[PDB]
Design a binder for this molecule. Sequence first.
Ligand SMILES: N[C@@H](CCCC[NH3+])C(=O)O
Lengths: 202, 332
Amino acid sequence: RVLTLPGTASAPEFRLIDIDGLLNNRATTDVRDLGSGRLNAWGNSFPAAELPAPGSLITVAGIPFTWANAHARGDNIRCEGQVVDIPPGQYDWIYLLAASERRSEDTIWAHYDDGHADPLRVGISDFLDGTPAFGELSAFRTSRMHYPHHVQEGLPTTMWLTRVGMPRHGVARSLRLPRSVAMHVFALTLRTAAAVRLAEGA
Amino acid sequence: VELWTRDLGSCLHGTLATALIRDGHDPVTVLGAPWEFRRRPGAWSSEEYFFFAEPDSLAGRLALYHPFESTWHRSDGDGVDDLREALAAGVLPIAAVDNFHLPFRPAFHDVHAAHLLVVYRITETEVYVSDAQPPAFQGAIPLADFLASWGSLNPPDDADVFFSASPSGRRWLRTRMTGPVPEPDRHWVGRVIRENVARYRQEPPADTQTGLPGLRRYLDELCALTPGTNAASEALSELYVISWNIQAQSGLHAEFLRAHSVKWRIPELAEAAAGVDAVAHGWTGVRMTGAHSRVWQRHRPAELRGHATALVRRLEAALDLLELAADAVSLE
Ligand SMILES: N[C@@H](CCCC[NH3+])C(=O)O
């Protein structure tokens, strides 16, 4: 048997997390910083010219993000189990812009104000002309890749939008990123919980 | 001649897949059916395509369940005569080359790395090559460039502590499917899964670390070494090399399970596929943590030990899921 009923969802709110103080790695370079790339162990990096302007507000698949205000020693978070404070509240989804040195999967911990913590599964696909193994959406696909001594034509660098749910009906206070040098986080936006009910008909 | 590779894979599976596709064989079936872990101390070489194969041939081991086998050859000339004869015979030669001398590779005149590609046509001025590793290329190449690559000395390179110091040696690989292929029905997939699991669980030989017990002992030995020391450097170089194509096989095996899961609509096969892919992703934590300690001196023994036991646990979870899958596909 089949029963489908129309619903209505509220207007949730997007909280764009300032990660500028956690930046610890350089994965993007310009033609004059080619030797500073540390996206992978071979010294590769994203092309800056094909990525957003530092500090700009962008939208990937409708989801808003702030591009990191990079310093010369960091333009993203290479994941080392950092704890990230978030505005306390009731949430639905975590959205990350990320890439990994080869595909990997790991855990984001979510910490709630009554001491409960939840281990949340996250997968991030490869930066190297990747394909989304976890059902990620594509955030960026460059034309070129940067190497320590040249700009490589016809080699896409890939970044992903990945989605992590927070099932618990409770107030979240912080998150822990995975402990894996392979994983790179470039932006982090959280989405609030919103109310849904049956709509007009039925 | 069709380009074929996967993001977890190297030129080893990729060149063999091209050869397999040309004879009418599905590379996911032939190369994705077997799934194992083995390590022989002293066996590895600094090549992108190293895989421990004894007592079988390189292709025979990578295609455990098919009559596919391979032979290595060394051409003794200064030219490409032995390759013209092989093509004339209908063979597709797989050439051992140095990326340093291939104009279409990013490593060209930057980095020495031992590599494989498919040769598919030889004129008197140009060699036609096919190479699916990103950035994929397929077409003609100046014959002098090919000969420089095919004959390179691959001297030790400070920018490739993994695939340098292995001379190309003008050697090449012949492959052949030497008889009827098995019908890939549900019983066969059942037996393939059960044999992979039984091999993983069994007690290793004295001379070879194999399966789940071998992987445990291997990872324990790795974590015991002192980071920064010479023993740790050679150990981490071996780790990154031998685990590329082992990780490759895990990702290929999961695809083999996904494909048959869709074919017969057996969710036990997709659930097991997810377990096997988790082992593939577990290798990333171990490999990359070792890779950055070896190359950039990022010494993190706690992370390396943490990814290691996570890998073992994922392997233990996979094996259990694979057994439920084999039960759902067939009665034993
Ligand atoms: N791309 C290879 C490196 C090979 C050596 C440079 N062409 C890897 O990801 O390990």
